[PDB]
Design a protein around this motif. Structure first.
Motif, PDB file in Angstrom:
ATOM      1  N   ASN A   1      39.728  50.577  42.453  1.00 30.55           N
ATOM      2  CA  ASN A   1      38.874  49.866  41.510  1.00 30.55           C
ATOM      3  C   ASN A   1      38.436  50.885  40.454  1.00 30.55           C
ATOM      4  OD1 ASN A   1      38.955  47.271  42.890  1.00 30.55           O
ATOM      5  ND2 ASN A   1      37.804  48.293  44.504  1.00 30.55           N
TER       6      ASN A   1
ATOM      7  N   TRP B   1      40.054  35.444  40.303  1.00 25.42           N
ATOM      8  CA  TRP B   1      40.582  36.723  39.873  1.00 25.42           C
ATOM      9  C   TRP B   1      41.354  36.519  38.569  1.00 25.42           C
ATOM     10  CZ3 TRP B   1      39.795  41.518  41.959  1.00 25.42           C
ATOM     11  CH2 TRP B   1      39.246  41.594  43.226  1.00 25.42           C
ATOM     12  N   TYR B   2      40.992  37.262  37.525  1.00 20.97           N
ATOM     13  CA  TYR B   2      41.664  37.156  36.240  1.00 20.97           C
ATOM     14  C   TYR B   2      42.463  38.427  35.977  1.00 20.97           C
ATOM     15  CZ  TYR B   2      38.807  33.065  35.395  1.00 20.97           C
ATOM     16  OH  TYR B   2      38.217  31.834  35.498  1.00 20.97           O
ATOM     17  N   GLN B   3      43.604  38.311  35.301  1.00 19.79           N
ATOM     18  CA  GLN B   3      44.358  39.510  34.985  1.00 19.79           C
ATOM     19  C   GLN B   3      43.872  39.936  33.610  1.00 19.79           C
ATOM     20  OE1 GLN B   3      48.702  39.507  35.005  1.00 19.79           O
ATOM     21  NE2 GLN B   3      48.748  41.702  34.651  1.00 19.79           N
ATOM     22  N   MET B   4      43.279  41.121  33.534  1.00 17.85           N
ATOM     23  CA  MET B   4      42.763  41.585  32.260  1.00 17.85           C
ATOM     24  C   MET B   4      43.716  42.534  31.582  1.00 17.85           C
ATOM     25  SD  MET B   4      40.173  39.634  32.305  1.00 17.85           S
ATOM     26  CE  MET B   4      38.850  39.810  31.080  1.00 17.85           C
TER      27      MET B   4
ATOM     28  N   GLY C   1      52.212  46.647  36.547  1.00 19.75           N
ATOM     29  CA  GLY C   1      51.273  46.058  37.486  1.00 19.75           C
ATOM     30  C   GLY C   1      49.995  45.569  36.839  1.00 19.75           C
ATOM     31  N   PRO C   2      49.282  44.659  37.524  1.00 14.16           N
ATOM     32  CA  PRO C   2      48.034  44.096  37.004  1.00 14.16           C
ATOM     33  C   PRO C   2      46.731  44.860  37.195  1.00 14.16           C
ATOM     34  CG  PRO C   2      48.531  43.012  39.022  1.00 14.16           C
ATOM     35  CD  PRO C   2      49.687  43.979  38.772  1.00 14.16           C
ATOM     36  N   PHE C   3      45.856  44.725  36.206  1.00 15.36           N
ATOM     37  CA  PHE C   3      44.505  45.265  36.233  1.00 15.36           C
ATOM     38  C   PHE C   3      43.739  43.941  36.209  1.00 15.36           C
ATOM     39  CE2 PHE C   3      40.456  46.194  34.209  1.00 15.36           C
ATOM     40  CZ  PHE C   3      40.089  47.379  34.826  1.00 15.36           C
ATOM     41  N   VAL C   4      43.129  43.595  37.340  1.00 12.73           N
ATOM     42  CA  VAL C   4      42.388  42.332  37.480  1.00 12.73           C
ATOM     43  C   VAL C   4      40.889  42.487  37.647  1.00 12.73           C
ATOM     44  CG1 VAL C   4      44.260  40.957  38.409  1.00 12.73           C
ATOM     45  CG2 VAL C   4      42.901  42.360  39.951  1.00 12.73           C
ATOM     46  N   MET C   5      40.172  41.404  37.403  1.00 15.32           N
ATOM     47  CA  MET C   5      38.724  41.397  37.545  1.00 15.32           C
ATOM     48  C   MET C   5      38.342  40.119  38.258  1.00 15.32           C
ATOM     49  SD  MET C   5      37.296  43.047  33.986  1.00 15.32           S
ATOM     50  CE  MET C   5      35.885  43.879  34.669  1.00 15.32           C
ATOM     51  N   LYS C   6      37.408  40.223  39.192  1.00  9.99           N
ATOM     52  CA  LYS C   6      36.967  39.038  39.906  1.00  9.99           C
ATOM     53  C   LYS C   6      35.730  38.532  39.202  1.00  9.99           C
ATOM     54  CE  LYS C   6      35.765  36.850  44.116  1.00  9.99           C
ATOM     55  NZ  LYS C   6      35.547  37.013  45.557  1.00  9.99           N
ATOM     56  N   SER C   7      35.767  37.279  38.769  1.00 10.42           N
ATOM     57  CA  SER C   7      34.634  36.746  38.043  1.00 10.42           C
ATOM     58  C   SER C   7      33.462  36.474  38.933  1.00 10.42           C
ATOM     59  CB  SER C   7      34.998  35.502  37.266  1.00 10.42           C
ATOM     60  OG  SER C   7      33.878  35.110  36.502  1.00 10.42           O
TER      61      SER C   7
ATOM     62  N   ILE D   1      47.620  45.163  31.898  1.00 12.31           N
ATOM     63  CA  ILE D   1      48.906  45.509  32.472  1.00 12.31           C
ATOM     64  C   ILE D   1      48.975  47.034  32.414  1.00 12.31           C
ATOM     65  CG2 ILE D   1      51.373  45.318  32.212  1.00 12.31           C
ATOM     66  CD1 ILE D   1      50.999  42.758  30.623  1.00 12.31           C
TER      67      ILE D   1
END
Lengths: 109, 150, 36, 12
Positions: free
Chosen positions: A14, A69-72, A57-63, A74
């Motif tokens: 994280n 989970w949103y992909q914010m 790969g993804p850089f995600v954030m949990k709202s 790459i």
């Protein structure tokens, strides 16, 4: 089969979002609004970064509002992996989203 | 990933593995954003500086994986690509601007406990979540340290 | 666009759908509040 | 020139 360096199983980390000025000041490259940087500052003690092979790969954030989970971003690039004063760069998905819409919605969106 | 830890299984159901038919090898990471569309970096497929220009028949997409190495029988779904879309304004020379590409699967994958698509931000979420200081999460089978090694 | 594109997206079968949290999901929440 | 400034695309 596996060794050390290349992990055996998927890895996670994280990372905090870093403000645009700091990202710009961190590199000689012409950063753009289409990209953002993340990672701990040298004054933070915490380490962690994406490295070779994590690209795409993804850089995600949990709202915290809804619990999705949103992909914010790459995993795009950086200057080595985890050097103090350096930050990993990531494509800006929300900013390129209109293009994503156009191609998925048959060259129109 | 550097300073990461082993992921719990099913932790990142959207995690896709871009792999090459021949020779066989891990090319990059990617994300399933629906049952037919996969998102990844344009440089994973096109990067002239390293003489890289993969077309549709060079890559396989492996979804539902945990282990980097072994073929995971029950959970893993290997797939082939129908189409490839690299952003038209992708700039590999100067700054790697618009480093985004979409992979269209031959046919829709079958979701499971291990295969589920991620959401794409929307104006409100982007505005609320994207603030310096706020943490996000990265996952991958990339290297653990900077290379002077394999 | 608005939140859910698929309505099911970002809701992990093994976690959010089972009301189970992953080991470090807390690190993310903690950096939240309204601090930025 | 990305490469000239040390920029590094992410396997080698």
């Amino acid at each position: 089969s596996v060794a050390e360096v290349q992990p055996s199983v998927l890895q996670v980390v994280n990372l905090p979002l870093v403000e645009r000025p700091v990202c710009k000041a961190s590199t000689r490259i012409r950063i753009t609004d289409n990209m953002f940087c993340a990672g701990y500052k040298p004054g933070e003690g915490k380490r962690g970064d994406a490295c070779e092979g994590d690209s795409g790969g993804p850089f995600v954030m949990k709202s915290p509002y809804n619990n999705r989970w949103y992909q914010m971003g790459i995993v795009s690039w950086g200057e080595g992996c985890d050097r103090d004063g350096k930050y990993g760069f990531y494509t800006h998905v929300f900013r390129l989203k209109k293009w994503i819409q156009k191609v998925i919605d048959r060259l129109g969106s | 990933i550097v300073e990461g830890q082993d992921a719990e299984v099913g932790l990142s159901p959207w995690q896709v593995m871009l792999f090459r038919k021949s020779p066989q090898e891990l090319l990059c990471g990617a994300s399933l954003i629906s049952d037919r569309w996969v998102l990844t970096a344009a440089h994973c497929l096109l990067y002239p500086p390293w003489d890289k220009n993969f077309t549709v028949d060079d890559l396989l997409v492996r979804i539902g994986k945990h282990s980097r190495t072994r073929y995971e029988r029950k959970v893993e779904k290997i797939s082939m690509l129908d189409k490839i879309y690299i952003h038209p304004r992708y700039n590999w020379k100067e700054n790697l601007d618009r480093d985004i590409a979409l992979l269209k699967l031959k046919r829709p994958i079958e979701l499971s406990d291990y295969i589920h698509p991620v959401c794409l931000p929307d104006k409100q979420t982007a505005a609320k979540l994207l603030h310096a200081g706020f943490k996000g999460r990265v996952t991958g089978w990339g290297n653990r340290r900077e290379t002077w090694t394999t | 666009t608005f939140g859910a594109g698929e309505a099911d997206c970002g809701l992990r079968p093994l976690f959010e759908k089972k009301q189970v949290q992953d080991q470090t999901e807390k690190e993310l929440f903690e950096s939240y509040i309204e601090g930025r | 020139d990305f490469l000239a400034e040390g920029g590094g695309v992410x396997p080698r």
